[PDB]
Amino acid sequence: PTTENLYFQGSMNIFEMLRIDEGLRLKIYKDCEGYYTIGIGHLLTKSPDLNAAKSELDKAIGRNCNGVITKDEAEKLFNQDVDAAVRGILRNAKLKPVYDSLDAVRRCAAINHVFQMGVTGVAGFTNVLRMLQQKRWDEAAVNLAKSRWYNQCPDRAKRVITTFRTGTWDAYKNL
Q1: Which cysteines share a disulfide bond?
Q2: Which terminal Cβ of the chain has fewer Cβ within 10 Å, N or C?
Q3: Which residues are registered as beta bridge partners of 39?
């Protein structure tokens, strides 16, 4: 690695990670599961009713958005969502000890996974959680690749799985 390559890890963090996996969209759109989404992976509702999603949006942002937000608004909502994912891990008796056992980069992958799937979905991967705590990285990654989360929407999940396998930021390089 050049001096530049050694710098790359200081440029990566949970915000830059999720920003890559989720993209940034200022208008309501449907995610790979068909759920109305906006900003940086903010799920608005699972209802197929666009009107419900606009209502959730106005509630989330605090103004009459009519389906569009600013970048600054996308970022504030994103910061709230990241904080919620972190809080969901740390208060959970199952997830917290596994999270604590992880290195900094795998902790980002953990937060990312919870941001995407929610706490109960992640806390339900009993085998993967055991494998992570036992540092069985290859097995953990192979088992994550069996999940519906990954298989229904591989592009959004592939880099997270790689990150659990390696504990490096390599999957986020050369976009």
Answers
A1: none
A2: C
A3: 25
